[PDB]
């Protein structure tokens, strides 16, 4: 944290944050969500971290260089240490990235090494070559060298993500899956795990061995797993929660803006809300069926007359404000709803869905007030504009992720946030073989468009290829885009250090501080 001159700091430096739900795990190679990443950034640190405005900055690596965007060399700081006092070395990174690539780890982010194009990743993922073949090497204890199969100019932007953080081999190898219990875990971030009570709380305390420990101000931070946005708000305003999760209740939002406007933080966020269609499950494997759902959805009612929290109606997957996105707006987005409905009714009828035989399916969402209210309004618009019957089903977070990876769903509420600010952070998730592809979308035409972006050394053709890739997804109606998020949350007036400037919202509790109040 960088405390301004003249700020008076409270005597007790502790913070309570709501985190939306119970995390799927504390192991960085086993996580895929925002709740999981919020806690991971405070425990495990990788080569680069984000500064308070979101820019990629030095983490364990003090400096780095590249040769042709293909060979990247990271010089690790000599005082980086684990919480048990042992040093963080280049060998930790070699071990960790081979463990992430290893099919046996079954990481939901296995494909993040493909996004980066580390040499040999495809064969390692496919079981053809051992993980030890990965293109990474420790030249010495403090120099980590990475070799790509192609020039990737934005490569270092990826490195702030939890998946490429280091894991302590000795604990992983001694305790297996219980290496993350408070008694066994070893961490290299600003905090260490003090307590973990499933469905109650996660308590972290400062890690004294952290190399930048002298700038850490908060000594203890608690993460709560409350998935009810109304409860998060009540407990914030009663004084128990200092920072809500960034899901706001439709029930109270307008009233909070009126009553505690200074506490309501609303900033740009690179995330898209959408309904994920299982592309492999009949009748969703029919493009007319997906296109009808996409068209009959009235975004103006949902975004502006139902949620009304500042989001923008979406027509694409990648948010249009992502760095390097130059998207073309589809013409159906330009039509009236009336024309969209007529066309939707027409396509559904071509697929064999009459009034005598309505299309019926389930809409799965992760337990939440906000997602339930939105699913009820959407089930209702689809009923009214298309005559389809929708069954709403809620699942707790970690189970809901599981269901989607397995493909046992029809339609699911979804929301992807960027891991790095470049259009492939979104587009790579739709690759046929991506481990993050829960749409189960497989398109060789889409896959080839993304492959070509790294075969050109021109940012205008790359952008033109990203816009054609969004157009291919749109043509296939792989998903139903709803809105581009605004990051809305409540932050007590005594929480300093949160600018709201990072569009990826990569918050580190080590940068925050409590003002005396």
């Amino acid at each position: 944290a960088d405390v301004p001159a003249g700020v008076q700091l409270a005597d007790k430096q502790t913070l309570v944050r709501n985190n939306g739900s119970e995390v799927q795990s504390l192991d960085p190679h086993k996580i895929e969500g925002v709740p999981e990443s919020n806690v991971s950034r405070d425990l495990f640190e990788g080569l680069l971290i984000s500064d308070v405005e979101g820019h990629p900055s030095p983490g364990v690596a003090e400096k780095w260089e590249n040769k042709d965007f293909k060979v990247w060399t990271f010089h690790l700081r000599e005082n980086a240490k684990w919480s048990d006092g042992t040093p963080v070395t280049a060998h930790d990174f070699v071990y960790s990235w081979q463990r992430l690539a290893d099919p046996n780890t079954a990481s939901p982010y296995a494909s993040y090494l493909q996004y980066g194009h580390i040499a040999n990743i495809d064969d390692i993922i496919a079981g053809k070559k051992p993980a030890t073949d990965l293109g990474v090497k420790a030249l010495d204890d403090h120099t980590f060298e990475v070799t790509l199969s192609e020039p990737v100019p934005y490569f270092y932007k990826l490195l702030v993500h939890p998946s490429v953080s280091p894991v302590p081999k000795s604990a992983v190898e001694k305790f297996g899956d219980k290496w993350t219990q408070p008694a066994n875990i070893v961490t290299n971030g600003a905090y260490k795990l003090k307590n973990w009570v499933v469905n109650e709380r996660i308590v972290l305390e400062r890690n004294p061995q952290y190399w930048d420990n002298a700038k850490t101000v908060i000594n203890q931070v608690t993460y709560l797993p409350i998935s009810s946005e109304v409860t998060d708000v009540n407990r914030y305003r009663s004084g128990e929660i200092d920072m809500t999760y960034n899901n706001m209740p439709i029930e109270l939002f307008q009233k909070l803006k009126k009553e505690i406007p200074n506490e309501v933080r609303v900033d740009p966020y690179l995330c898209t809300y959408y309904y994920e269609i299982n592309n492999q499950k009949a009748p969703f494997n029919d493009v007319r069926v997906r296109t009808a759902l996409k068209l009959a959805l009235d975004r103006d009612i949902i975004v502006n007359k139902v949620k009304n929290q500042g989001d923008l109606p979406a027509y694409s997957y990648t948010p249009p404000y992502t760095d390097g996105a130059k998207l073309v707006e589809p013409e159906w987005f330009k039509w009236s709803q009336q024309k969209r409905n007529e066309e939707a009714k027409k396509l559904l009828a071509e697929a064999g869905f009459t009034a005598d035989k309505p299309l019926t399916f389930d809409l799965l969402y992760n337990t939440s007030d906000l997602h339930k209210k939105l699913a009820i309004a959407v089930a209702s618009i689809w009923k009214k504009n298309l005559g389809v019957n929708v069954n709403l089903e809620n699942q707790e977070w970690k189970t809901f992720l599981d269901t989607r990876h397995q493909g046992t769903f029809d339609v699911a509420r979804a929301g992807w946030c960027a891991d790095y600010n470049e259009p492939t952070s979104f587009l790579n998730t739709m690759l046929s073989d991506s481990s993050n592809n829960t749409a189960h979308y497989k398109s060789p035409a889409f896959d080839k468009l993304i492959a070509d972006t790294l075969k050109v050394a021109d940012d205008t053709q790359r952008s033109e290829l990203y816009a054609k890739a969004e157009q291919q997804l749109d043509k296939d109606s792989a998903i139903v885009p709803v809105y581009y998020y605004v990051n809305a949350r409540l932050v007590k007036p005594w929480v300093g250090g949160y600018t709201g400037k990072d569009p990826l919202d990569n918050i580190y509790v080590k940068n925050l501080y409590i003002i005396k109040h």
Partner: peptide, 4 residues
Amino acid sequence: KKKA
């Protein structure tokens, strides 16, 4: 990352 998947946003809950």
